C-alpha cells in the first residue's frame, strides 16, 4: 500500500511539473507569434524623394 501511495505521489508531482511547464511554452509560442510580421518605416520613403 505504501508503494501505491508513492506511485500516485510521483504521478501527482509529475502532473504538478508539467502543468507548470505547460504555461511557459504558451508564453513562448506567443513570443514566436509577434516576432515575424513586419512594417516599413519612413526610412524607406525618404530616399525615393532624392
Amino acid at each position: 500500500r505504501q508503494q501505491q501511495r508513492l506511485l500516485r505521489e510521483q504521478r501527482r508531482a509529475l502532473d504538478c511539473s508539467n502543468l507548470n511547464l505547460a504555461r511557459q511554452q504558451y508564453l513562448q509560442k506567443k513570443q514566436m507569434n509577434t516576432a515575424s510580421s513586419s512594417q516599413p518605416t519612413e526610412d524607406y520613403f525618404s530616399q525615393f524623394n532624392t
Binding site: 516576432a35 515575424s36 510580421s37 513586419s38 512594417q39 516599413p40 518605416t41 526610412d43 524607406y44 530616399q47 525615393f48 532624392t50
Partner: protein, 427 residues
C-alpha cells in the same frame, strides 16, 4: 577568403554604381566622410568581401571607374560619396565619345585598355582570393559597350576561373533615342554571349510602368530607378555578406540556374512594393509576399513570361521566416500552374533564405528568373537590324573607322543561332 571587385562602365553605369554604392554604405552605416560608426557586428565582419580597410577606419570601395567625358566624373566625384571613391580609381580618356561603339572598341580603348588593366590587376593583387567580378553598364550604351566588350575579353584569359557577372540595361523597346543603337546592341551581344556567364536584363519602360503601378508618384528621378535596380542588386548580394542558412555563392546558384552553356541572360524579381495607403493596408505575410512575389505586374525586366514558359526560377528570401512557409508556398505555386513550367525539368524552383533583414523591413525577398520570354527582345532587334542593314544606313562612319559588313554577318547569325536555340529547347 573570397571577395569581389566591381567595375563601373558607361555613362549610365556611372549613375548605376554611384547609387549602387551609396546604398551599401548606408546599408553598412558608414558616413559620407568615411568614418564607419560601429553598430552591427555582422556587417562589421563581412564588409571585406567588397571593401578594403584603409587608415582611420575608412572602408575603400573596391570598384574602378572608367569613362571619357569628364563632366560625368566631376558630377559623381562631387556627389555625397564621391570622397569615398579613389582618384586612383578614376581612369578616363581625353576624347569625346560620339557614342560610337567602334571608337570605344577599337580606337579609344587601345590607349586606355593598358591603363585600366594595370589598375584592376593592382586591385586584383591588392586582394587575396576573388569569386570574380561584376559590371555596371548598358548593352545599348555607346561607350560602355565599347569598354565592356573589350575588357571582358581581356579579363577572360586573365582570370578564366572567376565569376564574370554582368549587369546591363536593355533600351526601351518603343524608342531607342540613339538610332545606331540597334547596331551597337547587336555588336555587343555577340561577344557577350561568347564571353559572359551571367547577365541581368533590365528595361526602363517597365520601371516607368512600375512607377505608374505602385510608386504612384507621377514624376520620379532616374536615380530612383537606379535605386530600384540597386535594391535588387543589393538583394542578390545580401546572400554573400550575410549569415543564415542560405547557400549564397554565385556558382552555387549559377549551376542551379543554367541548364545549357549559352544561357546567360536572366531576369530579376523583387519583393514588397507598396503604395501610400497600402503600407497600413497590408498584412505582411509570406503568402501575400509569395503572391506578390510571383506577379506579372511584379515583373520588371523585359516583358511578361505569360507569353512563354519558365525554365528555372530562384527566389532568395531575406528576413525572419522559416522553412515551412516557403516549403508550402512553393508547393502552392507548382499546383497552381504545373503546365506553365517545362516538362523538361521538374522541380525547377531554387530557394534561399537570408535571415538578416534590410534596414527598415524584415519580410523581404528577391527573384532571379530564366524563362522563355526573351524571344520578343532580340526578335524585335532582328527586324531593326535587318531593316537598317537592308539599306546600310549610317554605315560610312563604321567603314571610316574600319568596320566591315562581314563582322555584321556572323554577329546577327550568332544572334539568330541563339534564337533557334531558345525555342527548340522550349518547344
Amino acid at each position: 577568403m573570397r571577395e569581389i571587385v566591381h567595375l563601373q562602365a558607361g555613362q549610365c553605369g556611372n549613375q548605376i554604381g554611384a547609387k549602387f554604392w551609396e546604398v551599401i554604405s548606408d546599408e553598412h552605416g558608414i558616413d559620407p566622410t568615411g568614418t564607419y560608426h560601429g553598430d552591427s557586428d555582422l556587417q562589421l565582419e563581412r564588409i571585406n568581401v567588397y571593401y578594403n580597410e584603409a587608415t582611420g577606419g575608412k572602408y575603400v570601395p573596391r570598384a574602378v571607374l572608367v569613362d571619357l567625358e569628364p563632366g560625368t566624373m566631376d558630377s559623381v566625384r562631387s556627389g555625397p560619396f564621391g570622397q569615398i571613391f579613389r582618384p586612383d580609381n578614376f581612369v578616363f580618356g581625353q576624347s569625346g565619345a560620339g557614342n560610337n561603339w567602334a571608337k570605344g572598341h577599337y580606337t579609344e580603348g587601345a590607349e586606355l585598355v593598358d591603363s585600366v588593366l594595370d589598375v584592376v590587376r593592382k586591385e586584383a593583387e591588392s586582394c587575396d582570393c576573388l569569386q570574380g567580378f561584376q559590371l555596371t553598364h548598358s548593352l545599348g550604351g555607346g561607350t560602355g559597350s565599347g569598354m565592356g566588350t573589350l575588357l571582358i575579353s581581356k579579363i577572360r584569359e586573365e582570370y578564366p576561373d572567376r565569376i564574370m557577372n554582368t549587369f546591363s540595361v536593355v533600351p526601351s523597346p518603343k524608342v531607342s533615342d540613339t538610332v545606331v543603337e540597334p547596331y551597337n546592341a547587336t555588336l555587343s551581344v555577340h561577344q557577350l554571349v561568347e564571353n559572359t556567364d551571367e547577365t541581368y536584363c533590365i528595361d526602363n519602360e517597365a520601371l516607368y510602368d512600375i512607377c505608374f503601378r505602385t510608386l504612384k508618384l507621377t514624376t520620379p528621378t532616374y536615380g530612383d530607378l537606379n535605386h530600384l535596380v540597386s535594391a535588387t542588386m543589393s538583394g542578390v548580394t545580401t546572400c554573400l555578406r550575410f549569415p543564415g542558412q542560405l547557400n549564397a555563392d554565385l556558382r552555387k546558384l549559377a549551376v542551379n540556374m543554367v541548364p545549357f552553356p549559352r544561357l546567360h541572360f536572366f531576369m530579376p524579381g523583387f519583393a514588397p512594393l507598396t503604395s501610400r495607403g497600402s503600407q497600413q493596408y497590408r498584412a505582411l505575410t509570406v503568402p501575400e509576399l509569395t503572391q506578390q512575389m510571383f506577379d506579372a505586374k511584379n515583373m520588371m525586366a523585359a516583358c511578361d513570361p505569360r507569353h512563354g514558359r519558365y525554365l528555372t526560377v530562384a527566389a532568395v528570401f531575406r528576413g525572419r521566416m522559416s522553412m515551412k512557409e516557403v516549403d508550402e508556398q512553393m508547393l502552392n505555386v507548382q499546383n497552381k500552374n504545373s503546365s506553365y513550367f517545362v516538362e523538361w525539368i521538374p522541380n525547377n524552383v531554387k530557394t534561399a533564405v537570408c535571415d538578416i533583414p534590410p534596414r527598415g523591413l524584415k519580410m523581404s525577398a528577391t527573384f532571379i528568373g530564366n524563362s522563355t520570354a526573351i524571344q520578343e527582345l532580340f526578335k524585335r532587334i532582328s527586324e531593326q537590324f535587318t531593316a537598317m542593314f537592308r539599306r546600310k544606313a549610317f554605315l560610312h562612319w563604321y567603314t571610316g573607322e574600319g568596320m566591315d559588313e562581314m563582322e555584321f554577318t556572323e554577329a546577327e547569325s550568332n544572334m539568330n543561332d541563339l534564337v533557334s536555340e531558345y525555342q527548340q529547347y522550349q518547344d
